[PDB]
Automatic annotation (TrEMBL), chain A:
GO BP term, example: mRNA export from nucleus
Full-sequence range covered: 230 to 458 of 916
Primary site of residence: nucleus
Function comment: Plays a role in the nuclear pore complex (NPC) assembly and/or maintenance. Required for the assembly of peripheral proteins into the NPC. May anchor NUP62 to the NPC. Involved in nephrogenesis. Functions as a component of the nuclear pore complex (NPC).
Family recorded in the similarity comment: Belongs to the nucleoporin Nup84/Nup107 family.
Keywords: Acetylation, Centromere, Chromosome, Kinetochore, Membrane, Methylation, mRNA transport, Nuclear pore complex, Nucleus, Phosphoprotein, Protein transport, Translocation, Transport
GO cellular component annotations of the record: cytosol; kinetochore; nuclear membrane; nuclear pore outer ring
The protein, known as: Nuclear pore complex protein
Subunit structure: Part of the nuclear pore complex (NPC). Forms part of the Nup160 subcomplex in the nuclear pore which is composed of NUP160, NUP133, NUP107 and Nup96; this complex plays a role in RNA export and in tethering Nup98 and NUP153 to the nucleus. Does not interact with TPR. Interacts with ZNF106.
Subcellular location: Chromosome, Centromere, Kinetochore; Nucleus, Nuclear pore complex; Nucleus membrane
GO molecular-function term, one example from the UniProt record: structural constituent of nuclear pore
UniProtKB/TrEMBL annotation, chain B:
Subunit and partners: At the nuclear pore: component of the Y-shaped Nup107-160 subcomplex of the nuclear pore complex (NPC). The Nup107-160 subcomplex includes NUP160, NUP133, NUP107, NUP98, NUP85, NUP43, NUP37, SEH1 and SEC13. At the COPII coat complex: interacts with SEC31A and SEC31B. Interacts with SEC16A. Interacts with SEC16B. Component of the GATOR2 subcomplex, composed of MIOS, SEC13, SEH1L, WDR24 and WDR59. The GATOR2 complex interacts with CASTOR1 and CASTOR2; the interaction is negatively regulated by arginine.
Protein name as annotated: Protein SEC13 homolog
SMART domains with a match to the protein in the record: WD40 (SM00320)
Gene3D superfamilies for the chain: YVTN repeat-like/Quinoprotein amine dehydrogenase
Organism taxonomic ancestry: Eukaryota, Metazoa, Chordata, Craniata, Vertebrata
Family that this chain belongs to: Belongs to the WD repeat SEC13 family.
Gene Ontology molecular function terms on file: structural molecule activity
Functional description taken from the UniProt entry: Functions as a component of the nuclear pore complex (NPC) and the COPII coat. At the endoplasmic reticulum, SEC13 is involved in the biogenesis of COPII-coated vesicles. Required for the exit of adipsin (CFD/ADN), an adipocyte-secreted protein from the endoplasmic reticulum.
UniProt-annotated location(s): Lysosome membrane; Nucleus, Nuclear pore complex
Source taxon at top rank: Eukaryota
Pfam families (alphabetical): WD40
Organism: Xenopus laevis (African clawed frog)
TrEMBL record, chain C:
Compartments where located: Nucleus membrane; Nucleus, Nuclear pore complex; Nucleus, Nucleoplasm
Natural source organism: Xenopus tropicalis (Western clawed frog)
Family: Belongs to the nucleoporin GLFG family.
Covered residues, full protein: 1278 to 1380 of 1790
Task of the protein: Plays a role in the nuclear pore complex (NPC) assembly and/or maintenance. NUP98 and NUP96 are involved in the bidirectional transport across the NPC. May anchor NUP153 and TPR to the NPC. In cooperation with DHX9, plays a role in transcription and alternative splicing activation of a subset of genes. Involved in the localization of DHX9 in discrete intranuclear foci (GLFG-body).
Protein name: Nuclear pore complex protein Nup98-Nup96
Length: 229, 294, 103, 49
C-alpha cells in the first residue's frame, strides 16, 4: 500500500503527515537521524543542571559599564562602541564590542550550538531565557510551520504556532547565506536550516557529521519537493 | 638605504630574500642571489616605529607580520614578486612589542603581545578570518617578551611512530615587566596558568627557548635588566622540576636572546654593543663560543 | 476580506510615504509596514537593502504567542536594565508593535 | 486495583509538583531568580570595579 495522492482540502499538517507516511526512503532516513541524535541526547543528559554554573545575565556588561563611565566621569574613553543593544547593532553600525562580552557570547554559542546540533530544544529555550536572548529564541521560530484545528468546541487552543511566511522565509535565509559574513554558529545553524552544502562544509568534519549532513540535506530537498507537489 | 639602524632583519627559508626592519618607519626588502642583491621593495605603512616582523612556514608559502609603535600590526603577503599589506590590526593602548609565528604543525597563528599588560593571539585562515584570542590581565603591568611552543621536541615521542599524528596541545612562555615570567597552556578554548616565575627581581628583557630537539627536558635562557641570565630547566613540569642556573653574570643590562635557525646555539645581545655567541658545550656547561661586535 | 480591503486602501498611502522615507527613515518605514501588515514587500525592501536582522524580525511579527511571552519577559528585563535611556524609542516603538503593547 | 486512598495523595503530590515545576521558578525553562541574584551581585561587582 505504498504512496498516495490528494489535493489541498484542510490544514497543511494534513500535507505534512501524508508526506511522512507515504515514502520509504525518507522514512529510513528519519530513523537513522533519530539514531544519531539519540546518540547526541544520550551524550547530553543533564547539561541543564551543568549550565547552573555557566551563567551571566548582563547584556554586554563591559560596554555597559564603559559607556556608563564615559557618561559618568570627568574622563570618558577614546574607544568606539555601539549606542545600541541591537543583536545587529555592531555590524550594522560597524562599531566594536568588548572581548569579554563577545567571548562569553562565543561560550554560550558552544552551549546552544551543540544543543541544537543535537536539537536539544527544551534546553535551547532554557538557555535563551537564561541569558536574555529572547530575540534569538524568537529567531529560532522562523521555520516551524503553522496550524490550528479549533473547528470544535469553544474557542480553544489547537495551534497558534508562528507565521505562515516560512517558505519564503527559508528562501530569505537561503539568500542571506549567499550573502555570508557570519559567525561560525549562526552560519552553521542557518546554512543548516537551509541545507546549504558549502556553508555547511565548515563545521561538520566528522564521519558522523558528514553522513548526518548528507541525510539532513537530502531529507530537506525531498521534503520541500513534495511540499510544493 | 635605511635612515635608522636596524633592529631586526630576516632572510627566508631559502636564503633568497631578505626583509630588513628598522625604526626608520619603513622596511626594505632585497632579493638574494649569487651574493648579489637588489632592493626589491621598501614597504611603508607603519605609523609607529617598527621593531619586529614574523615570517611563516614554507608549506604555507611566504607570509610576514610586523609591529609598530602606533599600536598597529601590519600583515603582508607576497604576490607575483609583490609583498603587500594584507591584514592590519589596532585597538591597542600601548605599542605592540612582540609578534611571533607558531609552528605550522599548529598552523598560521601569530602571537601578539604588548606592554599593555595583556596579549592577543591572532589566527589567519590563510584566506579567511583573523581569529582573536585575547587574554586580559596577562600582566599586572605589561608584556615584554613572548615565545611559543615549538611543536615537536623529544621526551615521550620515541615510541610514537612517524606515520601517525600526535595530539597538538598548545602551550607557550613569556616574561613581562611586572618582574615576573609566566607559562601558559591552552584548554577549554582558553589559556590557563602553567607557571609563575619570580627570580629576576627586575624586569625581564628577552627570553630564549632552547630548541630542544634531542632534549626530553625544557630549557629557558632568560635575560633581564638586572644582569642575571637564568637557564631555567625542567625535565617535567607535572613534577614541577624547574630550576635556575647561571649562564653568565654580565654586568650590563642584559638584552636579547635568539636561537640559531640551525637550532644549535644562542646569540645574546649585551649592553656592550656586542652579541655573544654561546653554545651549551658537549659536556655540561654553557660556553661563549664566539662573539659579534655589533 | 477586510485584509484585502486594507491592501487596496493602503496602496496610495504606501506610494506617498515611500517617496518620503528611506534607510534613514527605515524605522518609520517599519512602522508603516507594520500598520499595513505588508510583510512581503517589507521583507523585499529589507533584502534589496541587505537588512538581514530586520528581515528576520519581520517574520516574528505574527509568530506564536510564545513570541510575545519572549517579548514580555525580555522587555521586563530591559526595564530592570534601564537601557531605554540609551536606546532610541524608535526601535522601541517597533518593539511595542511586535509585543502588542500600545502604551 | 486497590489503594485508591493512597492514589489520592499520589495525585495531590503530582499536582503540587506540577505547580512547583510549571510555576515557582523550578525546572523546564522557568526564570530562576538565582540568575537575577547573579545580575544584582554583578552590579555590585561593577560597583567595586
Amino acid at each position: 500500500n505504498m504512496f498516495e495522492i490528494a489535493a489541498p482540502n484542510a490544514s497543511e499538517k494534513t500535507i505534512v503527515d501524508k508526506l511522512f507516511q507515504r515514502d520509504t526512503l525518507v522514512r529510513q532516513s528519519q530513523l537513522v537521524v533519530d539514531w544519531l541524535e539519540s546518540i547526541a541526547k544520550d551524550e547530553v543528559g543533564d547539561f541543564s543542571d551543568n549550565i547552573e554554573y555557566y551563567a551571566k545575565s548582563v547584556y554586554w556588561e563591559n560596554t555597559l559599564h564603559t559607556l556608563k563611565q564615559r557618561s559618568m566621569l570627568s574622563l570618558g574613553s577614546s574607544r568606539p562602541l555601539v549606542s545600541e543593544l541591537d543583536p545587529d547593532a555592531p555590524i550594522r553600525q560597524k562599531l566594536p564590542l568588548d572581548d569579554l562580552d563577545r567571548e562569553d557570547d562565543i561560550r554560550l554559542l558552544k552551549y546552544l550550538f551543540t544543543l541544537i546540533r543535537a536539537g536539544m530544544t527544551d534546553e535551547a529555550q532554557r538557555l535563551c531565557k537564561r541569558c536574555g536572548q529572547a530575540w534569538r529564541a524568537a529567531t529560532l521560530e522562523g521555520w516551524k510551520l503553522y496550524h490550528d484545528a479549533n473547528i470544535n468546541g469553544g474557542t480553544e487552543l489547537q495551534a497558534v504556532e508562528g507565521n505562515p511566511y516560512r517558505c519564503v522565509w527559508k528562501t530569505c535565509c537561503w539568500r542571506m547565506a549567499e550573502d555570508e559574513q557570519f559567525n561560525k554558529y549562526e552560519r552553521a545553524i542557518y546554512a543548516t536550516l537551509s541545507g546549504n552544502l558549502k556553508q555547511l562544509l565548515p563545521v561538520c568534519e566528522s564521519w558522523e557529521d558528514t553522513v548526518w549532513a548528507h541525510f539532513k540535506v537530502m531529507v530537506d530537498s525531498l521534503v520541500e519537493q513534495e511540499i510544493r507537489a | 638605504s635605511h635612515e635608522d639602524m636596524i633592529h631586526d632583519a630576516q632572510m627566508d627559508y631559502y636564503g633568497i630574500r631578505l626583509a630588513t626592519c628598522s625604526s626608520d618607519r619603513s622596511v626594505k626588502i632585497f632579493d638574494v642571489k649569487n651574493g648579489g642583491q637588489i632592493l626589491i621593495a621598501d614597504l611603508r605603512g607603519h605609523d609607529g616605529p617598527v621593531w619586529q616582523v614574523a615570517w611563516a612556514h614554507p608549506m604555507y608559502g611566504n607570509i610576514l607580520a610586523s609591529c609598530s609603535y602606533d599600536r598597529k600590526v601590519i600583515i603582508w603577503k607576497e604576490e607575483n614578486g609583490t609583498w603587500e599589506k594584507t591584514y592590519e590590526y589596532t585597538g591597542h593602548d600601548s605599542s605592540v612589542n612582540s609578534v611571533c609565528w607558531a609552528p605550522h604543525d599548529f598552523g598560521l597563528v601569530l602571537a601578539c603581545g604588548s606592554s599593555d599588560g595583556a596579549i592577543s593571539i591572532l589566527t589567519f585562515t590563510g584566506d579567511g578570518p583573523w581569529e582573536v584570542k585575547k587574554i586580559s590581565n596577562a600582566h599586572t603591568i605589561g608584556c615584554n617578551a613572548v615565545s611559543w611552543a615549538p611543536s615537536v621536541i623529544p621526551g615521550s615521542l620515541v615510541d610514537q611512530p612517524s606515520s601517525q599524528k600526535p595530539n597538538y596541545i598548545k602551550r607557550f612562555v613569556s616574561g613581562g615587566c611586572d618582574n615576573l615570567v609566566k607559562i601558559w597552556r591552552e584548554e577549554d578554548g582558553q589559556w590557563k596558568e602553567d607557571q609563575k616565575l619570580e627570580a629576576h627581581s627586575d624586569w625581564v628583557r628577552d627570553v630564549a627557548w632552547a630548541p630542544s630537539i634531542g632534549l626530553p627536558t625544557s630549557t629557558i635562557a632568560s635575560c633581564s635588566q638586572d644582569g642575571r641570565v637564568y637557564i631555567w630547566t625542567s625535565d617535567d613540569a607535572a613534577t614541577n622540576c624547574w630550576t635556575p642556573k647561571l649562564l653568565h653574570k654580565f654586568n650590563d643590562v642584559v638584552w636579547h636572546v635568539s636561537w640559531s635557525i640551525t637550532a644549535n646555539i644562542l646569540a645574546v645581545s649585551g649592553g656592550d654593543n656586542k652579541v655573544t655567541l654561546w653554545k651549551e658545550s658537549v659536556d655540561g656547561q654553557w660556553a661563549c663560543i664566539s662573539d659579534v661586535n655589533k | 476580506a477586510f485584509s484585502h480591503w486594507l491592501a487596496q486602501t493602503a496602496q496610495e498611502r504606501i506610494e506617498e510615504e515611500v517617496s518620503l522615507y528611506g534607510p534613514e527613515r527605515h524605522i518609520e518605514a517599519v512602522f508603516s509596514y507594520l500598520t499595513g501588515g505588508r510583510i512581503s514587500d517589507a521583507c523585499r525592501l529589507a533584502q534589496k537593502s541587505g537588512d538581514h536582522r530586520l528581515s528576520l524580525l519581520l517574520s516574528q511579527m505574527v509568530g506564536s504567542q510564545e513570541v510575545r511571552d519572549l517579548i514580555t519577559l525580555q522587555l521586563v528585563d530591559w526595564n530592570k536594565l534601564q537601557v531605554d535611556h540609551y536606546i532610541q524609542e524608535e526601535r522601541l516603538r517597533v518593539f511595542c508593535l511586535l509585543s502588542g503593547t500600545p502604551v | 486495583m486497590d489503594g485508591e486512598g493512597f492514589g489520592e495523595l499520589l495525585q495531590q503530590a503530582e499536582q503540587l509538583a506540577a505547580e512547583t515545576e510549571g510555576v515557582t521558578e523550578l525546572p523546564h525553562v522557568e526564570r530562576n531568580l538565582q540568575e537575577i541574584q547573579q545580575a544584582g551581585e554583578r552590579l555590585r561587582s561593577k560597583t567595586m570595579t
